[PDB]
Amino acid sequence: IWFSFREISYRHAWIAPLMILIAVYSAYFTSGNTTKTNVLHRFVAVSYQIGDTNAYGKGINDLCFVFYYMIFFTFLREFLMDVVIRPFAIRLHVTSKHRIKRIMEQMYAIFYTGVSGPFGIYCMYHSDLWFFNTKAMYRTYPDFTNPFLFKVFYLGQAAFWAQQACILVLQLEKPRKDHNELTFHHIVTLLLIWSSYVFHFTKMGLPIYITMDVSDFLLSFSKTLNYLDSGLAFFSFAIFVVAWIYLRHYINLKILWSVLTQFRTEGNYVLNFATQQYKCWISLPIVFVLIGALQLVNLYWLFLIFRVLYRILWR
Amino acid sequence: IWFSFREISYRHAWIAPLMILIAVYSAYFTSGNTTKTNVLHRFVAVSYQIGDTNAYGKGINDLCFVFYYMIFFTFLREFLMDVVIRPFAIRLHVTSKHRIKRIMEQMYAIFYTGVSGPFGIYCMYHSDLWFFNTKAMYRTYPDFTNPFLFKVFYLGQAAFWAQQACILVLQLEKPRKDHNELTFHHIVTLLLIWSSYVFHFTKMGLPIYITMDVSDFLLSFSKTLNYLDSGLAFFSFAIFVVAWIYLRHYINLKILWSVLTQFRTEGNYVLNFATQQYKCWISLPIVFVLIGALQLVNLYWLFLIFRVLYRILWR
Amino acid sequence: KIFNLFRVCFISLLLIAAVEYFKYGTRINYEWFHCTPIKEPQSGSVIKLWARGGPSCDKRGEYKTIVKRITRDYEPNDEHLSFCIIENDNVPPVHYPIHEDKGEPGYVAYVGYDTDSELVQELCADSTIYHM
Amino acid sequence: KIFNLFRVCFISLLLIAAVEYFKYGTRINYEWFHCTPIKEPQSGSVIKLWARGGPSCDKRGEYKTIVKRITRDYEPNDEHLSFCIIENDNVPPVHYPIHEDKGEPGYVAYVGYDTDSELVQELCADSTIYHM
Numbered sequence: 001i002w003f004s005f006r007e008i009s010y011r012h013a014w015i016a017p018l019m020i021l022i023a024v025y026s027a028y029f030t031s032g033n034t035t036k037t038n039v040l041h042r043f044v045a046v047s048y049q050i051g052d053t054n055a056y057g058k059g060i061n062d063l064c065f066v067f068y069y070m071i072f073f074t075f076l077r078e079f080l081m082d083v084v085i086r087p088f089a090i091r092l093h094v095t096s097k098h099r100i101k102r103i104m105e106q107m108y109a110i111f112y113t114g115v116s117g118p119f120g121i122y123c124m125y126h127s128d129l130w131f132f133n134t135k136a137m138y139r140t141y142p143d144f145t146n147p148f149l150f151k152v153f154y155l156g157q158a159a160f161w162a163q164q165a166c167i168l169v170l171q172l173e174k175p176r177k178d179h180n181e182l183t184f185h186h187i188v189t190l191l192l193i194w195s196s197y198v199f200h201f202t203k204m205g206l207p208i209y210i211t212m213d214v215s216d217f218l219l220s221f222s223k224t225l226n227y228l229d230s231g232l233a234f235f236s237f238a239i240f241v242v243a244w245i246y247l248r249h250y251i252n253l254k255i256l257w258s259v260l261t262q263f264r265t266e267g268n269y270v271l272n273f274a275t276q277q278y279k280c281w282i283s284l285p286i287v288f289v290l291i292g293a294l295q296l297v298n299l300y301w302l303f304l305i306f307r308v309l310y311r312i313l314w315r
Numbered sequence: 316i317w318f319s320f321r322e323i324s325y326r327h328a329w330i331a332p333l334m335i336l337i338a339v340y341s342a343y344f345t346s347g348n349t350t351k352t353n354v355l356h357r358f359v360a361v362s363y364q365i366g367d368t369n370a371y372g373k374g375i376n377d378l379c380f381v382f383y384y385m386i387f388f389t390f391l392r393e394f395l396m397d398v399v400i401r402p403f404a405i406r407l408h409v410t411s412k413h414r415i416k417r418i419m420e421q422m423y424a425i426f427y428t429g430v431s432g433p434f435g436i437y438c439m440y441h442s443d444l445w446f447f448n449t450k451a452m453y454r455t456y457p458d459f460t461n462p463f464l465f466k467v468f469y470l471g472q473a474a475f476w477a478q479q480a481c482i483l484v485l486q487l488e489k490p491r492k493d494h495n496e497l498t499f500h501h502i503v504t505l506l507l508i509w510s511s512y513v514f515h516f517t518k519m520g521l522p523i524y525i526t527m528d529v530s531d532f533l534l535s536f537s538k539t540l541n542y543l544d545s546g547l548a549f550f551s552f553a554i555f556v557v558a559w560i561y562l563r564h565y566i567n568l569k570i571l572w573s574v575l576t577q578f579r580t581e582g583n584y585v586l587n588f589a590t591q592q593y594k595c596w597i598s599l600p601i602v603f604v605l606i607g608a609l610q611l612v613n614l615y616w617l618f619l620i621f622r623v624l625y626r627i628l629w630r
Numbered sequence: 631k632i633f634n635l636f637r638v639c640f641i642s643l644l645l646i647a648a649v650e651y652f653k654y655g656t657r658i659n660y661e662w663f664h665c666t667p668i669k670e671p672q673s674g675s676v677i678k679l680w681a682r683g684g685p686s687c688d689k690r691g692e693y694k695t696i697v698k699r700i701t702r703d704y705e706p707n708d709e710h711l712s713f714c715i716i717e718n719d720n721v722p723p724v725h726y727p728i729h730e731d732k733g734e735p736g737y738v739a740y741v742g743y744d745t746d747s748e749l750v751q752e753l754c755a756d757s758t759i760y761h762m
Numbered sequence: 763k764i765f766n767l768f769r770v771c772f773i774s775l776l777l778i779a780a781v782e783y784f785k786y787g788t789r790i791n792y793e794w795f796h797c798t799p800i801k802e803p804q805s806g807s808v809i810k811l812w813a814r815g816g817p818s819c820d821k822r823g824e825y826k827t828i829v830k831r832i833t834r835d836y837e838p839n840d841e842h843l844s845f846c847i848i849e850n851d852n853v854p855p856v857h858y859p860i861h862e863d864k865g866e867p868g869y870v871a872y873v874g875y876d877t878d879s880e881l882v883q884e885l886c887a888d889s890t891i892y893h894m
């Protein structure tokens with residue numbers, strides 16, 4: 001039965017992560033107690049719940065949760081992509097290899113973006129930051145403990161991007177036109193997640209997720225719908241041009257100006273290392289540099305997008 | 316005049332270090348004051364003299380002195396070896412290239428060993444450690460400040476071995492039979508000098524210098540006198556067999572047993588990190604390991620020497 | 631040839647400095663190598679600090695470890711603590727037997743807070759009480 | 763392929779931990795980032811310690827920097843020092859104006875030795891004197 005098994009599992013590449021996570025899940029759920037005193041609970045749930053309220057703190061359990069979700073997201077990817085996406089793609093009749101392997105990779109981006117796009121907006125609805133209200137991101141800066149959902153969104157996405165950064169290092173094969181600006185993209189997504197989560201500017205990180213997800217969802221939607229026959233996918237290009245414009249540009253130009261202007265005159269602006277509040281005159285350069293790098297790459301994608309808009313329309 | 320100059324200076328290889336050290340010496344001696352307030356004094360003399368007595372402490376000036384003597388010993392080497400030794404060698408009539416370049420390198424070892432051999436014995440004469448008296452090496456262990464001469468011998472030899480270790484790394488060319496046991500030799504000579512100087516076991520380091528110098532002097536004497544016509548160089552082999560035997564073996568077996576037995580029951584044996592005295596139950600393993608490594612290599616050279624004794628005599 | 635030489639020259643110097651920092655570093659703060667802070671919690675948030683070590687735990691070491699514990703286990707930006715440090719005078723500065731029945735401690739501290747400040751004030755018979 | 767992956771996974775984790783140690787490390791000992799120890803030498807080996815900083819130099823920070831200076835600038839295995847730490851009570855725990863005319867200090871210490879112990883005893887009007 002054995003080498004039939006490696007061939008079987010060579011084909012499919014979701015089976016090993018599925019086995020790992022089903023074993024962990026089963027062992028956690030059949031042990032009876034599901035309280036915080038386990039070990040599987042440190043890995044299969046957000047730790048740190050403060051008392052019996054809904055505000056969770058930070059620690060190393062967070063790293064354990066992030067790593068176990070790397071394991072879970074890999075399986076997802078592979079399961080999904082191969083099982084549903086490959087099969088729907090080859091129902092479709094668009095049949096080839098630059099076009100199908102690349103429609104397939106788009107196809108999984110719209111899946112996850114629909115899930116993350118709305119999770120994030122939903123998470124900022126139940127809060128004080130509604131429709132990117134900057135006053136709120138800092139009105140209470142240290143934030144040593146965010147909420148449940150919000151902590152989960154934050155580490156669910158570190159779990160998701162980390163793993164993708166690790167998959168593009170692992171060196172799959174072919175980048176081509178991009179991998180350079182896209183690697184800038186990956187590394188900066190990961191430093192902002194890590195930085196912001198760990199220095200307590202989490203309510204800064206929440207708005208930017210909303211912009212990236214809601215714009216990238218429509219981007220990948222247009223790319224898939226174009227990769228297939230078009231019909232209207234050009235209505236998805238208008239829509240993505242305006243989602244992208246409003247969201248990434250205006251959205252973040254207003255958050256970046258929020259950073260100069262209201263990092264200063266909001267919250268507590270003394271360095272005070274003992275209270276662990278670093279909102280001062282030193283961290284303002286670092287924050288501005290990070291979001292400025294995001295805005296640079298986004299206008300670089302805006303030049304690609306605007307070159308394509310007059311190009312395509314006028315050729 | 317210029318490329319004539321690089322060819323000139325290519326030939327000779329002492330001219331650049333000579334220029335450097337003559338410039339430094341001249342600048343130090345012509346500035347008028349030669350007190351400790353200069354900068355050239357930090358480099359061209361032992362620093363740290365405690366008050367106006369004769370007991371000097373330790374610091375970074377010591378590193379500056381060691382580096383400037385690297386520069387001085389290089390010039391010496393080259394000057395000597397080329398200027399006197401090469402010329403006396405080619406007076407000699409022994410004329411070839413394994414034999415002459417190797418007589419030349421011996422020839423400089425006997426020069427310096429005669430100088431260091433006696434400096435070291437002289438330095439232990441004016442002390443409390445006469446004829447390797449172990450009671451004394453520890454009777455007062457911390458030693459944060461040794462004497463003038465003794466500090467100079469200590470750093471004159473770090474200056475000399477360091478540079479030779481650096482010349483054998485610099486990769487001159489041909490090792491062959493040795494460089495392996497000889498590299499063990501160099502690295503351990505340097506860790507003992509550095510260690511012992513810096514952890515205050517300097518009166519431990521002084522006896523071992525005496526053994527190494529007085530034995531190696533006779534060794535290189537026999538090797539030179541054999542490389543030439545012999546006549547009697549076999550009287551220099553008896554003598555070196557007995558210098559080596561008494562000195563390296565008995566000498567250090569008694570110092571190593573001094574280490575188990577009298578590191579414990581002499582001086583202060585409490586760890587006391589605040590007083591900087593590390594003579595405890597933890598440092599005893601380290602000291603024993605270091606001198607045990609020296610003794611291992613020395614019996615390894617003793618097997619080479621004893622193989623040669625029955626070999627040569629019986630072939 | 632030369633690269634090798636410079637690379638070895640920089641690891642040797644790194645390690646020269648790493649060991650110089652062991653000496654300095656363990657010397658300036660030795661109160662942790664020799665003194666072990668023993669705390670005896672009283673009724674409430676009041677705990678009684680002292681130290682237990684070898685002859686290398688002199689009164690300076692006990693004072694430093696008590697101060698470190700007081701200022702590191704209590705956060706005064708929550709609420710404010712109030713402590714007193716009580717010296718034992720019938721003791722030379724170096725007094726711990728190296729063995730295992732140590733004896734009395736050089737410095738005994740009663741740290742506290744402010745919700746039960748009265749208890750600390752009462753345990754600190756007449757010594758000055760320090761507020762942070 | 764895979765080596766690259768594991769090597770990047772270990773620098774990222776090294777830097778995750780390096781920054782966690784910046785936070786922890788600068789938090790437990792902040793008395794050096796915000797408080798600058800100003801010492802005013804009296805007649806002899808007696809010097810008067812205090813601290814000067816922003817609003818982040820609370821009474822705890824002043825006490826820690828005074829203690830650090832007292833136990834790090836004087837070696838009691840030469841001879842023994844004897845110091846008193848004097849609190850200023852007409853002061854809230856957070857009192858330094860962020861600007862530049864600071865005001866009175868929270869904690870003022872007179873450290874000394876033993877050859878001029880009388881001077882320290884006289885400058886420490888009624889506060890307890892601590893021997894190390």
Ligand SMILES: CCCCCCCCCCCCCCCCCCCCCCCCCC(=O)SCCNC(=O)CCNC(=O)[C@H](O)C(C)(C)COP(=O)(O)OP(=O)(O)OC[C@H]1O[C@@H](n2cnc3c(N)ncnc32)[C@H](O)[C@@H]1OP(=O)(O)O
Nearest residue numbers: 189192193195196205212216223226278282283304305312
């Ligand atoms: C002192 C104290 C110290 C204290 C210190 C304090 C330190 C303090 C530290 C504090 C830190 C503070 C914390 C803050 C940080 C927060 C965390 C951040 C989290 C980040 C998460 C990020 C979000 C998640 C990431 C994601 O989500 S993934 C990354 C996102 N990146 C993208 O998404 C890529 C964008 N890329 C593009 O935009 C494309 O580059 C693109 C080309 C434009 C595409 O355009 P395209 O979309 O290509 O559209 P087309 O489909 O092409 O459609 C149209 C088609 O019409 C076709 N045509 C039709 N007729 C014609 C015709 N007659 N002639 C010629 N062509 C024709 C034509 O063919 C064309 O197409 P064609 O053939 O020309 O290509």
Ligand SMILES: CCCCCCCCCCCCCCCCCCCCCCCCCC(=O)SCCNC(=O)CCNC(=O)[C@H](O)C(C)(C)COP(=O)(O)OP(=O)(O)OC[C@H]1O[C@@H](n2cnc3c(N)ncnc32)[C@H](O)[C@@H]1OP(=O)(O)O
Nearest residue numbers: 504507508510511520527531538541593597598619620627
């Ligand atoms: C918790 C608290 C923490 C606290 C922690 C506390 C930490 C605490 C740390 C505290 C640390 C504590 C501090 C302590 C450390 C102190 C510092 C150390 C400083 C070290 C400085 C070292 C000293 C300086 C170094 C120097 O000075 S340099 C290094 C020394 N190394 C050597 O010197 C190499 C030895 N090597 C050999 O011994 C050769 O290997 C050798 C082959 C035997 C040669 O023997 P050979 O001499 O070869 O003699 P032949 O000339 O050969 O003569 C005889 C010739 O008779 C010839 N023959 C005559 N008739 C015959 C015949 N009828 N048949 C056949 N052959 C015949 C024949 O040919 C033969 O020769 P043949 O042809 O066979 O070769």
